[PDB]
Amino acid sequence: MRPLTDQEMKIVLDKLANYMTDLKSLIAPLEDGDRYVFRMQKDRVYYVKLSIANIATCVARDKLLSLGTCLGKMTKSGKFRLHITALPILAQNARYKIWVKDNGAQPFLYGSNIVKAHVGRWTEDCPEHSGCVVYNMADIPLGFGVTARSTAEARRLDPTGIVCFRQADCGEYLRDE
Amino acid sequence: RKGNKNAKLGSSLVVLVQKLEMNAKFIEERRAKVDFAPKDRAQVDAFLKDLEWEKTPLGAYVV
């Protein structure tokens, strides 16, 4: 376990800025004089409180497996990738939101891109390729992805037309079960 | 304390606010297990009927 370098912190926040608005709130101090930090453990980035990070130093690095919330992993080529383990963070301050109906929630959880027939609520003035968080009709976050077309251009699209590209779904939890 | 030099007045208010946090905390722990649905309000209507105002942390101060 070691903190991030300045190159790695820039890469991690760049990916997060694609999906969220107020990144200052992520690292802002808390009431009890504590704050959230970023940690790297086996090319995996973890979002965790500083107090938890300090008391987790007692665990040997070959014996530590998880810590706080895992945002994702740095790939072999030096590129941060988000994972669905970071979805609760993404939904808290999501910039653009898409809501899928019942007929689109199950296909999304199996790993399919959202189409027009699945959308039940948009977010107006959303550019072409932007990071959006996917919810169902009960405001339950299902995952996140990147939009395929602009909101204005998606309205005139065919029912069987891709409106969002899938990047992570909660069905991946069945994978590592 | 960056005003006047009334440390006695400062201490009087300092101990006053501390007693208020203790009382605010005192009620907080007590009410954490109370149902207050808009239809039925029996528990809140009988929240602390069997308690006197002397037992509260502010009551111990005021006496």
Partner: protein, 356 residues
């Protein structure tokens, strides 16, 4: 032989033992009446002699048959609502809308739900993937109700391989404080990490340690939970290998490790705690060499801890005396659970308070 013939003899032998004073035979003693009850119980229910006589000594005749009948029948599936995400009324209503038959598991938990049947897989439902419930066992609910953790404490869970209990402490802690989740197995730890992230837990550290190293590693925990690995005499329905693969050798090494684990849990905790210094020891076994014998050992070699009232509503008092073994009289506070009495797995809960 004829299995239905064995059942008739089993029933015949039990009623004889109930009324041996008036209904008996010419000169055969009740010693070989019980011994006959041993063979036909072994042959019918598929137990070896060592465990069956062990189980028969635990219970009297007509309760014992109810115990052996309960072990063959499966147990109902129960789910635990994640307080970190929702509460029971919507999750019941949400699953009812999808075709799941639900009732509250009972009046003793505001969090558990009981499922009869469903038209969709219960482990793939969208609110499951959202982290709104976890498939757990009703016996697993009990240890965390005995060890109720408050906010802003440090907790130690010494065996969190499935993850149901560790998530429950996080829910009761409202995602505040620190939870040390520990598994000596890397393979099972991956499932715990997945359960933690699915259920939205942020205040946990998953470490892969042997639980006997913990006072050396960190120490100072406010509340420590210990589910010792055991024979599995209360989970016989899910694991039938217990019926024949538990001999005298196994029942000698297992309490030794459990005794070593309990002492580690005692030393791990903090007696001078602002909120609590409680230790809860739990087991999914019914045998006395793994329950109330390890508890007696802890009280006899650590005179700085004391058994306290467990706090669960239902349960049966622990055993004070056994086959020549005299225990500390305070062991009556410990509770037992049986499948035939309560439709929950065989279980045992003990709760300690550290004072020095």
């Amino acid at each position: 032989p004829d299995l239905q013939m064995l059942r008739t003899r089993i029933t015949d032998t039990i009623r004889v033992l109930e009324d041996f004073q008036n209904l008996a035979e010419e000169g055969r003693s009740r010693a070989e009446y019980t011994n006959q009850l041993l063979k036909d119980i072994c042959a019918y229910y598929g137990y070896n002699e060592y465990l069956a006589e062990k189980l028969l000594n635990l219970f009297p005749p007509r309760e014992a048959f109810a115990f052996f009948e309960a072990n063959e029948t499966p147990r109902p599936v129960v789910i635990r609502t994640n307080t970190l995400r929702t509460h029971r009324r919507d999750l019941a209503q949400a699953l009812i809308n999808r075709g799941v038959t639900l009732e509250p598991v009972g009046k003793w938990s505001k969090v558990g739900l009981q499922v009869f049947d469903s038209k969709v897989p219960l482990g793939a439902t969208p609110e499951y993937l959202a982290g709104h419930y976890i498939l757990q066992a009703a016996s697993s609910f009990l240890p965390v109700m005995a060890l109720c953790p408050q906010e802003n404490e440090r907790c130690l869970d010494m065996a969190a391989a499935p993850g149901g209990k560790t998530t429950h402490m996080a829910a009761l802690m409202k995602n505040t404080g620190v939870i040390f989740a520990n598994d000596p197995s890397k393979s099972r730890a991956k499932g715990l990490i997945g359960n933690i992230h699915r259920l939205g837990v942020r205040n946990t550290i998953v470490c892969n340690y042997d639980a006997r190293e913990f006072p050396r590693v960190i120490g100072g925990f406010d509340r420590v939970l210990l589910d010792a690995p055991c024979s599995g005499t209360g989970v016989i329905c899910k694991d039938p290998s217990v019926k024949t693969n538990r001999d005298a050798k196994d029942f000698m090494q297992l309490p030794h490790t459990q005794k070593q684990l309990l002492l580690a849990a005692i030393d791990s905790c903090n007696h001078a705690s602002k909120t609590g210094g409680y230790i809860v020891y739990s087991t999914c076994s019914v045998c006395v060499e793994e329950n109330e014998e390890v508890v007696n050992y802890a009280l006899s070699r650590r005179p700085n801890v004391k058994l306290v009232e467990t706090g669960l509503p239902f349960g049966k008092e622990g055993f004070t005396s056994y086959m020549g073994k005299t225990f500390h009289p305070s062991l009556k506070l410990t509770r037992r659970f049986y499948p035939h009495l309560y439709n929950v797995d065989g279980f045992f809960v003990a709760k300690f308070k550290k004072i020095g």
